[PDB]
């Protein structure tokens, strides 16, 4: 915790290794409130090379650097290149630019630099990477996070003794104090957009805005220090010369950790009530059996603000979703059994072992038909007796509600089946809407790194941008004005592609620009096969103008996706891959024939206040994934040289959470659930542009 708690080690190698690890940004901050002199010696000895220093507590070569005003001058030259956002990540060709801004607006559902106090990284020139370490290294003062320039800016009197303890003058010290306070990092926004800075078009007031995404030092440093502590699933990105990228990258030897949560789709084997008991909201025993209740009865009686009956209904609203979740859990394995029994008409995983498993594919659960089994329900009522032995073993049987839960399970039976539901929707309009189903789309070498924090699926903003490019081309081709408002995304196949990408020869910039190969940037790439369902709005004149031209609809389908090449299914597949639908029942009748191993990419409504809550929430549920949600704007939109559009803005990629739901779960949850809680839209606001539900 404290500085000299780590100085107790007699072995200098272990001591200096622990000290160099302690003052690096990929670890926790140590307290130097008691130890200011010794702290200054090590912080000023860190300014040297590793092979130049034997021991960091040698006082004389610290005074050699401190007395030499060719050494401290370089350290105060490097303060002007202190960033809150690294423009040189991952491409180091972004020439002599510094972005220092306040954190953006705080959002409940996404994670950014708004969720932490304003900390600084450094990125200018690899030659001066050590010279930054004096004035950019973060420590713990009194009870406050601070760095040397900030603590010497105002509270100098506390450090006068520590600085004069070596034999520094008062004249030089106060001149150093005022020049450091004058040379503090200002609000630095670049005057022009760099050639190697990535720009995208986001929909602004009545047009488009040029957005450059820049990583935040704080969120990266938190993910790095979370990855060294071995708290979540991480994969590696290696850099050639890390000192040219940043100091954080230089400290880690260029090996940067990213959140690795890809979708897992297996073609192979099925191997009980198992899927429920495993989902563990659910069952077997506990978290949270048993209610035994009293708990449920007490909750209803408290909610009896506004009349015992009206309260029970208000309890139900949350407690029915909770009671529905209990049935959904219980149904997870009933789903799997059924599933098998279709594919098969033969088998489960093991036909006999299934028949043996108390809650598996029984020839009695075989049917009657789905439809007639739900209409029968009977099975659901019987399973309540089986739930005297599993789905809560013994305790909490007649107890506050078991009858109500049995009734909900009997109602769910009707919902669990077939040839039912059907109609009546404010969404989109209706005058009518359309549903464009794109099926069996193959993509080769799409960027798996959604943002430079997260690895797994491609970005949802990439799916949005592709759909928006498709809309623009169609509306310009046909002369219509239809809108591609929302989409749902089902992944059939996913595979990670090994190896880096070799860049071609070009005029690489210097004092004299020469024809040569650029630096090899490491990335993550995936081959994936997916289906998209796009929800089209507009006038029936425009919709039936769209429906009349199927070849022109097929023609303007883009061939680019997240940097990868996007193809329609193979010509011998016999798959009509570009289908329009007027009604929802016909679409859902088509959609429940999907492969069962595939995953729906589903929006969630979980709130996250910092990284540790997100990591606990990821360690909670095995089917959640941290992904790119969109852009939190840092600067104000204005005219900037090198911009694609009229107005340019620097933004930060926001980390949200998606769910990889099974095809069966979405099939059993009903048509209403699918059409309300599976569709993505871009909430484009003044200061943020984020992907969300509805």
């Amino acid at each position: 915790m404290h500085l000299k708690e780590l100085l107790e080690i007699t072995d200098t190698t272990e001591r200096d290794r622990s000290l160099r690890r302690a003052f690096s940004p990929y670890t926790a901050m140590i307290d130097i409130t008691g130890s200011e002199a010794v702290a200054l010696i090590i912080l000023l000895n860190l300014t040297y090379r590793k092979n130049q220093v034997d021991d960091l507590l040698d006082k004389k070569l610290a005074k050699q650097a401190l007395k030499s005003e060719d050494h401290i001058n370089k350290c105060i030259k490097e303060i002007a290149w202190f960033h809150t956002h690294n423009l040189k990540y991952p491409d180091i060709r972004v020439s002599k630019q510094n972005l220092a801004v306040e954190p953006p607006t705080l959002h409940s559902y996404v994670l950014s630099s708004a969720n932490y106090p304003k900390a600084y990284g450094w990125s200018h020139n690899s030659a001066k990477v050590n010279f930054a370490k004096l004035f950019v290294s973060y420590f713990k003062w009194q009870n406050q996070v601070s760095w040397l320039a900030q603590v010497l800016a105002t509270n100098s009197d506390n450090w006068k003794s520590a600085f004069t303890s070596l034999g520094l003058s008062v004249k030089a010290f106060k001149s150093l104090c005022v020049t450091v306070k004058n040379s503090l990092p200002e609000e630095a926004i670049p005057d022009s957009v760099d050639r190697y800075s990535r720009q995208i078009r986001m929909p602004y007031h009545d047009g488009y805005l040029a957005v450059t995404p820049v990583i935040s030092h704080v969120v990266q440093s938190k993910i790095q220090q979370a990855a060294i502590d071995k708290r979540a699933r991480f994969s590696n990105v290696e850099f050639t010369r890390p000192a040219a990228v940043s100091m954080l990258a230089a400290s880690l030897g260029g090996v940067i950790n990213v959140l690795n949560y890809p979708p897992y789709i297996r073609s192979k084997y099925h191997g009980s009530n198992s899927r429920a008991f495993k989902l563990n909201n659910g069952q077997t025993v506990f978290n949270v059996e048993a209610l035994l209740k009293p708990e449920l009865i007490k909750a209803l009686e408290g909610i009896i603000f506004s009349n015992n009956a009206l309260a029970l209904k208000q309890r139900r609203q949350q407690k029915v979703k909770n009671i529905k979740e209990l049935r959904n859990t219980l149904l997870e394995w009933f789903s799997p059994v059924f599933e098998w029994r279709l594919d098969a008409i033969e088998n489960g995983y093991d036909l006999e072992q299934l028949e043996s498993a108390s809650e598996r594919l029984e020839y009695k659960i075989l049917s009657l038909p789905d439809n007639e089994l739900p209409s029968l329900t009977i099975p659901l009522f019987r399973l309540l007796n089986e739930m005297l032995g599993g789905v809560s073993m013994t305790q909490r049987y007649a107890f506050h509600p078991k009858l109500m839960s049995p009734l909900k399970a009997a109602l769910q039976w009707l919902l669990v089946n077939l040839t039912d539901q059907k109609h009546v929707l404010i969404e989109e309009d209706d005058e009518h809407y359309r549903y464009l189903h794109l099926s069996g789309i193959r993509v080769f070498d799409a960027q798996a790194l959604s943002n430079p924090y997260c690895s797994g699926i491609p970005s949802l903003t990439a799916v949005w941008g592709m759909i928006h490019s498709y809309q623009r081309k169609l509306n310009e081709a046909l002369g219509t004005n239809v809108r591609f408002t929302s989409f749902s995304w089902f992944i059939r196949n996913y595979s990670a592609v090994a190896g880096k990408k070799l860049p071609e020869l070009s005029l690489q910039g210097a004092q004299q620009s020469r024809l040569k190969r650029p630096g090899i940037i490491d990335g993550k790439y995936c081959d994936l096969v997916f289906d998209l369902i796009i929800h089209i709005d507009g006038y029936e004149d425009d919709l039936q103008a769209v429906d009349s031209k199927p070849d022109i609809l097929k023609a303007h389908f883009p061939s680019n996706f997240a940097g990868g090449v996007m193809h329609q299914p193979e010509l011998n597949s016999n798959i009509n891959w570009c289908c329009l639908y007027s009604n929802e029942n016909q679409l859902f009748e088509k959609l429940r024939r999907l492969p069962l191993s595939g995953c729906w990419v589903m929006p969630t409504e979980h709130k996250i206040q910092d990284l540790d809550e997100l990591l606990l929430l990821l360690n909670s549920d095995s089917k959640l994934s941290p992904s790119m949600m969109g852009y939190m704007l840092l600067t104000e939109p204005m005219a900037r040289v090198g911009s694609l559009e009229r107005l340019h803005c620097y933004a930060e990629p926001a980390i949200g959470v998606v769910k990889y739901e099974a095809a069966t779960s979405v099939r059993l949850k009903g048509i209403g659930n699918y059409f309300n809680s599976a569709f993505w839209m871009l909430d484009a606001q003044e200061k943020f542009m984020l992907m969300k539900k509805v």
Binding site: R195, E238, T240, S267, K268, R442, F444, D445, A477, N493, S495, V497, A498, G499, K500, K501, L502, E504, L505, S506, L507, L515, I520, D527, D551, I552, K554, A555, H556, F557, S559, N560, V565, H567, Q568, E570, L571, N572, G642, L644
Partner: protein, 341 residues
């Protein structure tokens, strides 16, 4: 002029080319690579000599020692008659108008240049060159003409073209009538796909090679400059199948590089066909055939669009005279795509 941050999407979109074979049971068995550990001789210049060409102070038996090499190998299984290499190709019309521009003056100029180049039938010549690269099997790279190769092309239009033997074809040789008919028809379809934005055009292209007994396959090799001590120093580009098996494959850019090996306008009597590049980069020699200091590079030719417009507007009427090869190179680079400042 400079054109103020001009941007073009590429027109040709090939996918991954997957190697496989067929049994009497299955119509797709993926060709898999096995890791083998072999001896290598110490046969390099630096093993024995200083940079001044003087013998190093080594032991008398240092050059008789071996390097332990961990390499990936792909062979045809014994008594498998045919190797199959299949890829898909999409063609879009992205060469007509710049996708990103600032000045509407150069936008109007380039759009006018594009449609007047279209009317003279330059896209036909470029389509013929791309089609000829597809028919002779340039995209097999080192597997080309190792056996009697038969190339089948199925199109989204509903056509079905077949080249019987690619060993009987070359770039400069005179073909049979049926092979010229295949070239003509498929060139027309590719040219139609390049010139019209309101048509969809895809193609499934399959090469069937008569395999020799346990013949070596030459797929794409991965880029790795941070290989570990345990791993193979030479690995191959793979594609995962329906099951948990990896077919050895070519990169999309590798196929793309083969199809666009059309540029032989860089000299008056150029025998070699370069991959279309802004500076005509030759991978074998390691020089630029259209160097940055010359007038033959793209950024020199691209400033004379107003003169090439006048030349084309004379060429459209005067009926016979050939188009300036600079304009062929110009539009080949526009079909390749990129950002031009």
């Amino acid at each position: 002029e400079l054109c103020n941050i001009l941007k073009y999407d590429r027109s040709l979109y090939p996918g991954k080319a997957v190697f496989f074979y067929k049994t009497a049971d299955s119509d797709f068995v993926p060709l898999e690579a096995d890791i083998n550990k072999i001896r290598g001789p110490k046969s390099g210049f630096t093993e024995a000599f200083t940079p001044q060409f003087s013998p190093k102070n080594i032991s008398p038996q240092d050059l008789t020692h071996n390097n332990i090499l961990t390499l990936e190998e792909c062979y045809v299984p014994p008594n498998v008659e045919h190797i199959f290499c299949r890829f898909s190709l999409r063609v879009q019309a992205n060469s007509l108008v710049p996708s990103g521009c600032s000045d509407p003056e150069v936008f109007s100029l380039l759009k006018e240049l594009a449609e007047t180049f279209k009317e003279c039938g330059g896209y036909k010549e470029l389509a013929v060159r791309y089609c000829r690269n597809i028919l002779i099997g340039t995209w097999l790279w080192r597997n080309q003409n190792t056996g009697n190769t038969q190339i089948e092309i199925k199109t989204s239009k509903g056509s079905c073209y077949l080249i019987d033997n690619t060993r009987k074809l070359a770039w400069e040789s005179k073909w049979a009538s049926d092979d010229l008919k295949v070239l003509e028809e498929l060139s027309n379809e590719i040219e139609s796909a390049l010139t019209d934005p309101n048509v969809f055009w895809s193609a499934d292209i399959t090469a069937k090679i008569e395999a020799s007994f346990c013949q070596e396959i030459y797929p794409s090799q991965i880029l790795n400059d941070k290989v570990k001590q345990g791993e193979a120093s030479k690995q191959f580009v793979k594609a995962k199948c329906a099951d948990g098996r990896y077919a050895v494959s070519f990169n999309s850019v590798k196929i793309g590089a083969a199809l666009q090996s059309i540029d032989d306008w860089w000299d008056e009597d150029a025998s070699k066909r370069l991959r279309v590049h802004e500076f005509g980069a030759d991978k074998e020699i390691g020089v630029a055939r259209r160097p940055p200091d010359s007038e033959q590079n793209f950024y020199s030719i691209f400033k004379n669009t107003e003169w090439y417009l006048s030349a084309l507007k004379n060429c459209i009427t005067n009926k016979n005279e050939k188009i300036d090869p600079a304009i062929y190179y110009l539009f080949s680079v526009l079909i390749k795509g990129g950002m031009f400042q």
